[PDB]
Amino acid sequence: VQLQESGGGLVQAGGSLRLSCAASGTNIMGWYRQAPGKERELVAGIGYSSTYYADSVKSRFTISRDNAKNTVYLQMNSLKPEDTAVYYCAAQNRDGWYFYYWGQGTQVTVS
Amino acid sequence: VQLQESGGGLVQAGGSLRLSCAAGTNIMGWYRQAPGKERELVAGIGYSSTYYADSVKSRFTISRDNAKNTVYLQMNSLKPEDTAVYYCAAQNRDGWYFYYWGQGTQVTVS
Amino acid sequence: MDQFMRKRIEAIRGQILSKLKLTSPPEDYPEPEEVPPEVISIYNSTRDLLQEKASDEEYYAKEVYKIDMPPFFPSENAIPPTFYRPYFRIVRFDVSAMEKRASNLVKAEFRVFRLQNPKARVPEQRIELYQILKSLTSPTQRYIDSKVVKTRAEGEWLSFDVTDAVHEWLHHKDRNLGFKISLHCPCCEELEARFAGIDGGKTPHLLLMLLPSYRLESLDAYCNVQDNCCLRPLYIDFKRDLGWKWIHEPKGYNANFCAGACPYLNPEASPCCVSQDLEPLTILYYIGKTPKIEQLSNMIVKSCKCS
Amino acid sequence: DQFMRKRIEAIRGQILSKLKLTSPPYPEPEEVPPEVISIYNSTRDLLQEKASREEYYAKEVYKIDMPPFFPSENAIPPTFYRPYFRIVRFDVSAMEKRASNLVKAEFRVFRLQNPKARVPEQRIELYQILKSKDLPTQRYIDSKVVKTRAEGEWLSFDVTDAVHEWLHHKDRNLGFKISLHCPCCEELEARFAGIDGGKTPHLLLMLLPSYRLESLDACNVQDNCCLRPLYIDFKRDLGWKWIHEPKGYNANFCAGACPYLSASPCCVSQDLEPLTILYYIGKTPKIEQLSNMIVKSCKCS
Ligand SMILES: *[C@@H]1O[C@H](CO)[C@@H](O)[C@H](O)[C@H]1NC(C)=O
Ligand SMILES: *[C@@H]1O[C@H](CO)[C@@H](O)[C@H](O)[C@H]1NC(C)=O
């Protein structure tokens, strides 16, 4: 399988940004986040258009997927200085409750 | 209320024909009276639920345009027994009667 | 048993007339050589209903009234009783005759016959019964009950408790909009179930059951004080009354017990004061280091009866 | 009387009989883990709910909570949100070895109080999510009518058959769905603890141990407590010619002696079934229903 992410950069304090994650190979999916120094955290998750959001991103971040194009989105609205990190989209292992598939991901830093 | 029908005439046995009934402020249906024989409720729409008669089952179809407030009657595969004057009828505002009728058009199958 | 049969017969004779509140049996009973078939039809629907259900307002007998589906005459100005659509069927009843008797209605049963569809697409479906409602921006149907039917199985009768709906229909005639037999389906496939009288002695019909007013003249802890069949308190403290220190929880429970003498002449042969309803009990005990949280059935006597 | 002293002794034997303990057992009650008290706390509260409205031997109750989610790991969360339904999944793999002894299972979820609910009353439905392939994706279990704005309460569903497959085919444990009822042509205003945010959603699996598995319909005629046939023909045995149909019904009766120890024994009726009669007064017909007329089985109590 293959996972390629895009979108992300520097955004004005309080702005918005849409991250993307395309699956170019062969399905619960989600987005992860790792701030400098801090450990990983599952920010958002899509699956059975069912969603799982984190508490720090609820009502601000939105997850979506285009089952036609096989791309998972992440609409980061009302950003805060604490949302700065590298974002890794992940897919589900064919039959397990694993993740297995990850990508390099892009980094976002809000001022 | 007001009831206006159209689309009635002569069709060869086994043909088709689409009757109309225009409404004026629900449940509506169509009646028919053959020469000599008394009335019979052929079709009725209501709750887009439908009631068809046993003699027209699998041939006639009822419908309504909620935008135009018009009830249709798609009569396909006509038979020499489908010859009569067709009267569409509406429902009284809250009772289980019909009350409102129209002049209706005539159909003649060959 | 020789003298025990002799009493049941006499106890049943009184029990029959008691539930009927007849001080003596009828005298001017007609002759069975000509009993209308419509009367035998009511006996058949009440009988067949109770046979299916096999799978002080309750003591006295109940009059059964049967309201069939309105007969449709296409030459008249009547709205048909049935309306079709691939996903539901609509039936409406004329219950105006029982509006006078609404103050005595106890239960109503909508009985419809489910035909056999040997060429059904899906062999099993869940159908839902709704009470049609008059509405904007508000409801158009009320849920009653659902049922899982076998579309290809032998014909069968299906019954629903539609008491509350008939209650409204008998009070507000302008709400008697009928029933709808809709397919369950998760959320907003055709209805493969065929019904006699709707998809074509198996007519859809209501079974109203009333309790006459003249029959309205006339055992938890009431148990005041008494010495007849009646619940008696008994609380078991495990350590005190049993010397058991291995049950950690509950420290004690009201076990209770039934006692007393029951009269003879008795809702049900000689009577005995026994327990009716019992409720299970949960205990937490231990063997070794293993905890056991277990469930014991029939441990608490909550009510008594005579039988 | 002093027959209470017998109830106490009959209860002593009834406890050890259902547990099949030939003699009573022991830890210290000064410190019993709270996790153990929670299993007792949930089984008690469950039966308390049923009170508000192969069977003899006791049943062990196992409590399986919702999997704890740690966002730093590579685990799929146990809950998924949607304005119209919620998805919860349990990990029941520990009980796969004991699947051959499961008797009943109930999924218990706590419904929180939503004082700001739009609709005050809603019908929620429980589904077992299923792994499909092409064109069902879910199976109906049970529904319930809840009050979204009422004081918090616990809601239980009998999910025995669904949990049963999960213990056999681990690849089918896709969880439950609490969907809002749809009339098939409004948001779920009911909030649940652990899903919409000691009230964790959990399963209560109830097993019957193997050593507790050993390894009166019409009466094997006998002279102990046992059903006895009795058919009463109204004309023959009652002299009644006013009941047109039924001509006669099997009334039956209970008789016999039950062992002594349960308190004192009596051979009585257990389940009774009503009787329909058609009679006449004047020219008026009466088709009426009489309850508790047919004895179908007997018991001792
Ligand atoms: C009534 O029930 C009997 C079953 O014994 C059946 O044979 C009969 O057809 C039913 N209907 C009538 C009208 O008797
Ligand atoms: C046990 O149940 C009681 C309810 O009476 C509750 O107050 C207590 O917190 C529960 N204990 C635990 C450990 O859940």
PDB file of N, CA and C in Angstrom, chain B residues 9-90:
ATOM      1  N   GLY B   9     -60.163  10.139 -25.397  1.00  0.00           N
ATOM      2  CA  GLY B   9     -60.608   9.994 -26.769  1.00  0.00           C
ATOM      3  C   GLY B   9     -60.709   8.562 -27.249  1.00  0.00           C
ATOM      4  N   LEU B  10     -60.287   8.309 -28.485  1.00  0.00           N
ATOM      5  CA  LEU B  10     -60.363   6.988 -29.095  1.00  0.00           C
ATOM      6  C   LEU B  10     -58.972   6.389 -29.241  1.00  0.00           C
ATOM      7  N   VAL B  11     -58.812   5.149 -28.780  1.00  0.00           N
ATOM      8  CA  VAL B  11     -57.545   4.432 -28.848  1.00  0.00           C
ATOM      9  C   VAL B  11     -57.810   3.025 -29.366  1.00  0.00           C
ATOM     10  N   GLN B  12     -56.891   2.512 -30.180  1.00  0.00           N
ATOM     11  CA  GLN B  12     -57.003   1.141 -30.664  1.00  0.00           C
ATOM     12  C   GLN B  12     -56.770   0.160 -29.520  1.00  0.00           C
ATOM     13  N   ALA B  13     -57.491  -0.958 -29.557  1.00  0.00           N
ATOM     14  CA  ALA B  13     -57.357  -1.991 -28.536  1.00  0.00           C
ATOM     15  C   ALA B  13     -55.895  -2.367 -28.340  1.00  0.00           C
ATOM     16  N   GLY B  14     -55.430  -2.265 -27.097  1.00  0.00           N
ATOM     17  CA  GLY B  14     -54.046  -2.514 -26.762  1.00  0.00           C
ATOM     18  C   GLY B  14     -53.161  -1.288 -26.749  1.00  0.00           C
ATOM     19  N   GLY B  15     -53.724  -0.101 -26.950  1.00  0.00           N
ATOM     20  CA  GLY B  15     -52.963   1.130 -26.972  1.00  0.00           C
ATOM     21  C   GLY B  15     -52.794   1.721 -25.589  1.00  0.00           C
ATOM     22  N   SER B  16     -52.427   3.001 -25.561  1.00  0.00           N
ATOM     23  CA  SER B  16     -52.172   3.717 -24.321  1.00  0.00           C
ATOM     24  C   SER B  16     -52.888   5.060 -24.348  1.00  0.00           C
ATOM     25  N   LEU B  17     -52.935   5.701 -23.183  1.00  0.00           N
ATOM     26  CA  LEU B  17     -53.563   7.005 -23.023  1.00  0.00           C
ATOM     27  C   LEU B  17     -53.303   7.485 -21.603  1.00  0.00           C
ATOM     28  N   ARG B  18     -53.000   8.773 -21.462  1.00  0.00           N
ATOM     29  CA  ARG B  18     -52.698   9.377 -20.168  1.00  0.00           C
ATOM     30  C   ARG B  18     -53.759  10.429 -19.871  1.00  0.00           C
ATOM     31  N   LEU B  19     -54.589  10.163 -18.870  1.00  0.00           N
ATOM     32  CA  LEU B  19     -55.594  11.115 -18.421  1.00  0.00           C
ATOM     33  C   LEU B  19     -55.005  12.050 -17.369  1.00  0.00           C
ATOM     34  N   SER B  20     -55.623  13.221 -17.239  1.00  0.00           N
ATOM     35  CA  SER B  20     -55.173  14.245 -16.312  1.00  0.00           C
ATOM     36  C   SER B  20     -56.359  14.783 -15.523  1.00  0.00           C
ATOM     37  N   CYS B  21     -56.055  15.349 -14.355  1.00  0.00           N
ATOM     38  CA  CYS B  21     -57.071  15.947 -13.492  1.00  0.00           C
ATOM     39  C   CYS B  21     -56.414  17.086 -12.727  1.00  0.00           C
ATOM     40  N   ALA B  22     -56.808  18.318 -13.036  1.00  0.00           N
ATOM     41  CA  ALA B  22     -56.218  19.505 -12.435  1.00  0.00           C
ATOM     42  C   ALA B  22     -57.106  20.029 -11.315  1.00  0.00           C
ATOM     43  N   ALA B  23     -56.472  20.522 -10.255  1.00  0.00           N
ATOM     44  CA  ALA B  23     -57.188  21.036  -9.093  1.00  0.00           C
ATOM     45  C   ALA B  23     -57.040  22.549  -8.994  1.00  0.00           C
ATOM     46  N   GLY B  24     -59.370  26.868  -5.770  1.00  0.00           N
ATOM     47  CA  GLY B  24     -58.825  25.535  -5.602  1.00  0.00           C
ATOM     48  C   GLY B  24     -57.769  25.469  -4.517  1.00  0.00           C
ATOM     49  N   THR B  25     -57.994  24.602  -3.533  1.00  0.00           N
ATOM     50  CA  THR B  25     -57.075  24.457  -2.410  1.00  0.00           C
ATOM     51  C   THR B  25     -56.294  23.153  -2.517  1.00  0.00           C
ATOM     52  N   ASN B  26     -53.804  14.978   1.338  1.00  0.00           N
ATOM     53  CA  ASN B  26     -55.038  14.908   0.565  1.00  0.00           C
ATOM     54  C   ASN B  26     -55.188  13.537  -0.087  1.00  0.00           C
ATOM     55  N   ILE B  27     -56.399  13.228  -0.548  1.00  0.00           N
ATOM     56  CA  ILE B  27     -56.703  11.943  -1.168  1.00  0.00           C
ATOM     57  C   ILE B  27     -57.541  12.201  -2.410  1.00  0.00           C
ATOM     58  N   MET B  28     -57.142  11.603  -3.532  1.00  0.00           N
ATOM     59  CA  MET B  28     -57.846  11.769  -4.796  1.00  0.00           C
ATOM     60  C   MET B  28     -57.881  10.433  -5.526  1.00  0.00           C
ATOM     61  N   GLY B  29     -58.820  10.312  -6.462  1.00  0.00           N
ATOM     62  CA  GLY B  29     -58.977   9.077  -7.206  1.00  0.00           C
ATOM     63  C   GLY B  29     -59.758   9.299  -8.483  1.00  0.00           C
ATOM     64  N   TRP B  30     -59.962   8.203  -9.215  1.00  0.00           N
ATOM     65  CA  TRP B  30     -60.647   8.220 -10.499  1.00  0.00           C
ATOM     66  C   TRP B  30     -61.800   7.228 -10.497  1.00  0.00           C
ATOM     67  N   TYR B  31     -62.930   7.641 -11.064  1.00  0.00           N
ATOM     68  CA  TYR B  31     -64.093   6.786 -11.244  1.00  0.00           C
ATOM     69  C   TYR B  31     -64.358   6.603 -12.735  1.00  0.00           C
ATOM     70  N   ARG B  32     -65.220   5.640 -13.055  1.00  0.00           N
ATOM     71  CA  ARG B  32     -65.547   5.338 -14.442  1.00  0.00           C
ATOM     72  C   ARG B  32     -66.936   4.720 -14.501  1.00  0.00           C
ATOM     73  N   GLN B  33     -67.691   5.075 -15.542  1.00  0.00           N
ATOM     74  CA  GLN B  33     -69.056   4.594 -15.733  1.00  0.00           C
ATOM     75  C   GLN B  33     -69.226   4.172 -17.185  1.00  0.00           C
ATOM     76  N   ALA B  34     -69.289   2.863 -17.417  1.00  0.00           N
ATOM     77  CA  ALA B  34     -69.520   2.343 -18.753  1.00  0.00           C
ATOM     78  C   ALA B  34     -70.982   2.529 -19.152  1.00  0.00           C
ATOM     79  N   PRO B  35     -71.270   2.545 -20.453  1.00  0.00           N
ATOM     80  CA  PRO B  35     -72.665   2.698 -20.898  1.00  0.00           C
ATOM     81  C   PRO B  35     -73.537   1.557 -20.400  1.00  0.00           C
ATOM     82  N   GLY B  36     -74.505   1.899 -19.554  1.00  0.00           N
ATOM     83  CA  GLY B  36     -75.410   0.918 -18.988  1.00  0.00           C
ATOM     84  C   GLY B  36     -75.017   0.495 -17.589  1.00  0.00           C
ATOM     85  N   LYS B  37     -73.718   0.349 -17.349  1.00  0.00           N
ATOM     86  CA  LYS B  37     -73.220  -0.082 -16.053  1.00  0.00           C
ATOM     87  C   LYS B  37     -72.974   1.122 -15.147  1.00  0.00           C
ATOM     88  N   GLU B  38     -73.012   0.869 -13.841  1.00  0.00           N
ATOM     89  CA  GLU B  38     -72.890   1.924 -12.849  1.00  0.00           C
ATOM     90  C   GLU B  38     -71.419   2.226 -12.564  1.00  0.00           C
ATOM     91  N   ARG B  39     -71.190   3.177 -11.662  1.00  0.00           N
ATOM     92  CA  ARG B  39     -69.846   3.650 -11.379  1.00  0.00           C
ATOM     93  C   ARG B  39     -68.997   2.558 -10.733  1.00  0.00           C
ATOM     94  N   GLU B  40     -67.682   2.741 -10.828  1.00  0.00           N
ATOM     95  CA  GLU B  40     -66.711   1.850 -10.207  1.00  0.00           C
ATOM     96  C   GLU B  40     -65.432   2.637  -9.969  1.00  0.00           C
ATOM     97  N   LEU B  41     -64.861   2.503  -8.774  1.00  0.00           N
ATOM     98  CA  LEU B  41     -63.608   3.177  -8.449  1.00  0.00           C
ATOM     99  C   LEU B  41     -62.459   2.375  -9.047  1.00  0.00           C
ATOM    100  N   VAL B  42     -61.830   2.922 -10.087  1.00  0.00           N
ATOM    101  CA  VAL B  42     -60.755   2.207 -10.765  1.00  0.00           C
ATOM    102  C   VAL B  42     -59.437   2.388 -10.023  1.00  0.00           C
ATOM    103  N   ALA B  43     -59.108   3.625  -9.658  1.00  0.00           N
ATOM    104  CA  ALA B  43     -57.836   3.919  -9.018  1.00  0.00           C
ATOM    105  C   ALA B  43     -58.021   5.013  -7.979  1.00  0.00           C
ATOM    106  N   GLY B  44     -57.136   5.011  -6.986  1.00  0.00           N
ATOM    107  CA  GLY B  44     -57.139   6.025  -5.951  1.00  0.00           C
ATOM    108  C   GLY B  44     -55.768   6.209  -5.334  1.00  0.00           C
ATOM    109  N   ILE B  45     -55.325   7.453  -5.192  1.00  0.00           N
ATOM    110  CA  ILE B  45     -54.063   7.758  -4.534  1.00  0.00           C
ATOM    111  C   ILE B  45     -54.377   8.490  -3.235  1.00  0.00           C
ATOM    112  N   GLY B  46     -53.402   8.495  -2.329  1.00  0.00           N
ATOM    113  CA  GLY B  46     -53.604   9.075  -1.018  1.00  0.00           C
ATOM    114  C   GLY B  46     -52.350   9.108  -0.172  1.00  0.00           C
ATOM    115  N   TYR B  47     -52.479   8.657   1.076  1.00  0.00           N
ATOM    116  CA  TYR B  47     -51.403   8.651   2.065  1.00  0.00           C
ATOM    117  C   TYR B  47     -50.012   8.581   1.445  1.00  0.00           C
ATOM    118  N   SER B  48     -48.306   8.904  -1.488  1.00  0.00           N
ATOM    119  CA  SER B  48     -48.303   8.306  -2.816  1.00  0.00           C
ATOM    120  C   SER B  48     -48.776   6.856  -2.779  1.00  0.00           C
ATOM    121  N   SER B  49     -49.481   6.490  -1.713  1.00  0.00           N
ATOM    122  CA  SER B  49     -50.080   5.167  -1.637  1.00  0.00           C
ATOM    123  C   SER B  49     -51.230   5.067  -2.633  1.00  0.00           C
ATOM    124  N   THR B  50     -51.440   3.865  -3.162  1.00  0.00           N
ATOM    125  CA  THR B  50     -52.354   3.668  -4.274  1.00  0.00           C
ATOM    126  C   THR B  50     -53.358   2.568  -3.967  1.00  0.00           C
ATOM    127  N   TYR B  51     -54.555   2.726  -4.531  1.00  0.00           N
ATOM    128  CA  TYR B  51     -55.554   1.667  -4.596  1.00  0.00           C
ATOM    129  C   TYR B  51     -55.993   1.534  -6.044  1.00  0.00           C
ATOM    130  N   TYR B  52     -55.745   0.375  -6.633  1.00  0.00           N
ATOM    131  CA  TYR B  52     -56.197   0.063  -7.977  1.00  0.00           C
ATOM    132  C   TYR B  52     -57.334  -0.943  -7.893  1.00  0.00           C
ATOM    133  N   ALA B  53     -58.155  -0.973  -8.934  1.00  0.00           N
ATOM    134  CA  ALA B  53     -59.212  -1.965  -8.985  1.00  0.00           C
ATOM    135  C   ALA B  53     -58.656  -3.301  -9.458  1.00  0.00           C
ATOM    136  N   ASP B  54     -59.432  -4.356  -9.217  1.00  0.00           N
ATOM    137  CA  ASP B  54     -58.997  -5.689  -9.613  1.00  0.00           C
ATOM    138  C   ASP B  54     -59.058  -5.858 -11.125  1.00  0.00           C
ATOM    139  N   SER B  55     -59.956  -5.129 -11.795  1.00  0.00           N
ATOM    140  CA  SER B  55     -60.123  -5.256 -13.238  1.00  0.00           C
ATOM    141  C   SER B  55     -59.064  -4.506 -14.035  1.00  0.00           C
ATOM    142  N   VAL B  56     -58.322  -3.601 -13.402  1.00  0.00           N
ATOM    143  CA  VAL B  56     -57.282  -2.827 -14.066  1.00  0.00           C
ATOM    144  C   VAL B  56     -55.904  -3.114 -13.498  1.00  0.00           C
ATOM    145  N   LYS B  57     -55.804  -4.034 -12.541  1.00  0.00           N
ATOM    146  CA  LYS B  57     -54.524  -4.395 -11.960  1.00  0.00           C
ATOM    147  C   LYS B  57     -53.530  -4.695 -13.073  1.00  0.00           C
ATOM    148  N   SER B  58     -52.292  -4.247 -12.889  1.00  0.00           N
ATOM    149  CA  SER B  58     -51.192  -4.453 -13.821  1.00  0.00           C
ATOM    150  C   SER B  58     -51.323  -3.643 -15.107  1.00  0.00           C
ATOM    151  N   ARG B  59     -52.330  -2.778 -15.243  1.00  0.00           N
ATOM    152  CA  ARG B  59     -52.445  -1.957 -16.446  1.00  0.00           C
ATOM    153  C   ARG B  59     -52.505  -0.463 -16.166  1.00  0.00           C
ATOM    154  N   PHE B  60     -53.365  -0.010 -15.257  1.00  0.00           N
ATOM    155  CA  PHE B  60     -53.489   1.419 -14.998  1.00  0.00           C
ATOM    156  C   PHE B  60     -52.589   1.842 -13.842  1.00  0.00           C
ATOM    157  N   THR B  61     -52.136   3.095 -13.903  1.00  0.00           N
ATOM    158  CA  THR B  61     -51.242   3.663 -12.904  1.00  0.00           C
ATOM    159  C   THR B  61     -51.715   5.060 -12.529  1.00  0.00           C
ATOM    160  N   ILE B  62     -51.722   5.346 -11.227  1.00  0.00           N
ATOM    161  CA  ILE B  62     -52.130   6.644 -10.701  1.00  0.00           C
ATOM    162  C   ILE B  62     -50.902   7.382 -10.188  1.00  0.00           C
ATOM    163  N   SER B  63     -50.964   8.710 -10.245  1.00  0.00           N
ATOM    164  CA  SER B  63     -49.869   9.557  -9.794  1.00  0.00           C
ATOM    165  C   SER B  63     -50.420  10.953  -9.532  1.00  0.00           C
ATOM    166  N   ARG B  64     -49.577  11.805  -8.951  1.00  0.00           N
ATOM    167  CA  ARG B  64     -49.964  13.174  -8.644  1.00  0.00           C
ATOM    168  C   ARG B  64     -48.735  14.069  -8.670  1.00  0.00           C
ATOM    169  N   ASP B  65     -48.918  15.295  -9.162  1.00  0.00           N
ATOM    170  CA  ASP B  65     -47.864  16.309  -9.196  1.00  0.00           C
ATOM    171  C   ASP B  65     -48.116  17.286  -8.053  1.00  0.00           C
ATOM    172  N   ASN B  66     -47.441  17.060  -6.923  1.00  0.00           N
ATOM    173  CA  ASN B  66     -47.624  17.926  -5.764  1.00  0.00           C
ATOM    174  C   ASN B  66     -47.317  19.383  -6.080  1.00  0.00           C
ATOM    175  N   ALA B  67     -46.500  19.646  -7.102  1.00  0.00           N
ATOM    176  CA  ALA B  67     -46.241  21.023  -7.504  1.00  0.00           C
ATOM    177  C   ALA B  67     -47.445  21.619  -8.224  1.00  0.00           C
ATOM    178  N   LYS B  68     -47.921  20.944  -9.270  1.00  0.00           N
ATOM    179  CA  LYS B  68     -49.033  21.436 -10.071  1.00  0.00           C
ATOM    180  C   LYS B  68     -50.398  21.065  -9.504  1.00  0.00           C
ATOM    181  N   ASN B  69     -50.456  20.187  -8.504  1.00  0.00           N
ATOM    182  CA  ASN B  69     -51.728  19.719  -7.954  1.00  0.00           C
ATOM    183  C   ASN B  69     -52.586  19.098  -9.056  1.00  0.00           C
ATOM    184  N   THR B  70     -52.003  18.129  -9.762  1.00  0.00           N
ATOM    185  CA  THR B  70     -52.679  17.418 -10.838  1.00  0.00           C
ATOM    186  C   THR B  70     -52.498  15.921 -10.643  1.00  0.00           C
ATOM    187  N   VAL B  71     -53.591  15.173 -10.770  1.00  0.00           N
ATOM    188  CA  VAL B  71     -53.579  13.720 -10.646  1.00  0.00           C
ATOM    189  C   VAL B  71     -53.644  13.123 -12.044  1.00  0.00           C
ATOM    190  N   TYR B  72     -52.745  12.189 -12.330  1.00  0.00           N
ATOM    191  CA  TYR B  72     -52.642  11.558 -13.638  1.00  0.00           C
ATOM    192  C   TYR B  72     -53.205  10.142 -13.588  1.00  0.00           C
ATOM    193  N   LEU B  73     -53.401   9.570 -14.778  1.00  0.00           N
ATOM    194  CA  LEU B  73     -53.887   8.196 -14.906  1.00  0.00           C
ATOM    195  C   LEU B  73     -53.294   7.619 -16.189  1.00  0.00           C
ATOM    196  N   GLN B  74     -52.209   6.861 -16.051  1.00  0.00           N
ATOM    197  CA  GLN B  74     -51.542   6.253 -17.201  1.00  0.00           C
ATOM    198  C   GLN B  74     -52.245   4.941 -17.529  1.00  0.00           C
ATOM    199  N   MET B  75     -53.090   4.967 -18.557  1.00  0.00           N
ATOM    200  CA  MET B  75     -53.851   3.799 -18.996  1.00  0.00           C
ATOM    201  C   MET B  75     -53.142   3.177 -20.195  1.00  0.00           C
ATOM    202  N   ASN B  76     -52.388   2.110 -19.950  1.00  0.00           N
ATOM    203  CA  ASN B  76     -51.679   1.392 -20.998  1.00  0.00           C
ATOM    204  C   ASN B  76     -52.346   0.048 -21.261  1.00  0.00           C
ATOM    205  N   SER B  77     -52.128  -0.466 -22.470  1.00  0.00           N
ATOM    206  CA  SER B  77     -52.666  -1.756 -22.893  1.00  0.00           C
ATOM    207  C   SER B  77     -54.185  -1.801 -22.718  1.00  0.00           C
ATOM    208  N   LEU B  78     -54.854  -0.851 -23.366  1.00  0.00           N
ATOM    209  CA  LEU B  78     -56.299  -0.732 -23.238  1.00  0.00           C
ATOM    210  C   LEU B  78     -56.995  -1.954 -23.831  1.00  0.00           C
ATOM    211  N   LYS B  79     -58.197  -2.214 -23.339  1.00  0.00           N
ATOM    212  CA  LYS B  79     -59.028  -3.325 -23.770  1.00  0.00           C
ATOM    213  C   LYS B  79     -60.415  -2.803 -24.097  1.00  0.00           C
ATOM    214  N   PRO B  80     -61.182  -3.529 -24.917  1.00  0.00           N
ATOM    215  CA  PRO B  80     -62.520  -3.040 -25.291  1.00  0.00           C
ATOM    216  C   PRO B  80     -63.442  -2.801 -24.106  1.00  0.00           C
ATOM    217  N   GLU B  81     -63.092  -3.282 -22.914  1.00  0.00           N
ATOM    218  CA  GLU B  81     -63.917  -3.094 -21.728  1.00  0.00           C
ATOM    219  C   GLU B  81     -63.564  -1.833 -20.949  1.00  0.00           C
ATOM    220  N   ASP B  82     -62.514  -1.113 -21.345  1.00  0.00           N
ATOM    221  CA  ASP B  82     -62.104   0.111 -20.671  1.00  0.00           C
ATOM    222  C   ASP B  82     -62.805   1.343 -21.231  1.00  0.00           C
ATOM    223  N   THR B  83     -63.945   1.161 -21.893  1.00  0.00           N
ATOM    224  CA  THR B  83     -64.666   2.255 -22.530  1.00  0.00           C
ATOM    225  C   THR B  83     -65.685   2.823 -21.549  1.00  0.00           C
ATOM    226  N   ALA B  84     -65.536   4.104 -21.220  1.00  0.00           N
ATOM    227  CA  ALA B  84     -66.434   4.760 -20.279  1.00  0.00           C
ATOM    228  C   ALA B  84     -66.072   6.230 -20.124  1.00  0.00           C
ATOM    229  N   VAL B  85     -66.869   6.965 -19.360  1.00  0.00           N
ATOM    230  CA  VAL B  85     -66.542   8.336 -18.988  1.00  0.00           C
ATOM    231  C   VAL B  85     -65.801   8.289 -17.660  1.00  0.00           C
ATOM    232  N   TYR B  86     -64.686   9.008 -17.578  1.00  0.00           N
ATOM    233  CA  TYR B  86     -63.789   8.935 -16.434  1.00  0.00           C
ATOM    234  C   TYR B  86     -63.912  10.209 -15.612  1.00  0.00           C
ATOM    235  N   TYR B  87     -64.266  10.052 -14.336  1.00  0.00           N
ATOM    236  CA  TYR B  87     -64.463  11.163 -13.412  1.00  0.00           C
ATOM    237  C   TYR B  87     -63.420  11.060 -12.307  1.00  0.00           C
ATOM    238  N   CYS B  88     -62.504  12.022 -12.251  1.00  0.00           N
ATOM    239  CA  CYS B  88     -61.607  12.111 -11.109  1.00  0.00           C
ATOM    240  C   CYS B  88     -62.341  12.753  -9.939  1.00  0.00           C
ATOM    241  N   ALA B  89     -61.962  12.354  -8.730  1.00  0.00           N
ATOM    242  CA  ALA B  89     -62.642  12.809  -7.529  1.00  0.00           C
ATOM    243  C   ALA B  89     -61.621  13.104  -6.445  1.00  0.00           C
ATOM    244  N   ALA B  90     -61.942  14.085  -5.611  1.00  0.00           N
ATOM    245  CA  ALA B  90     -61.106  14.481  -4.492  1.00  0.00           C
ATOM    246  C   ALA B  90     -61.783  14.097  -3.182  1.00  0.00           C
TER     247      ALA B  90
END
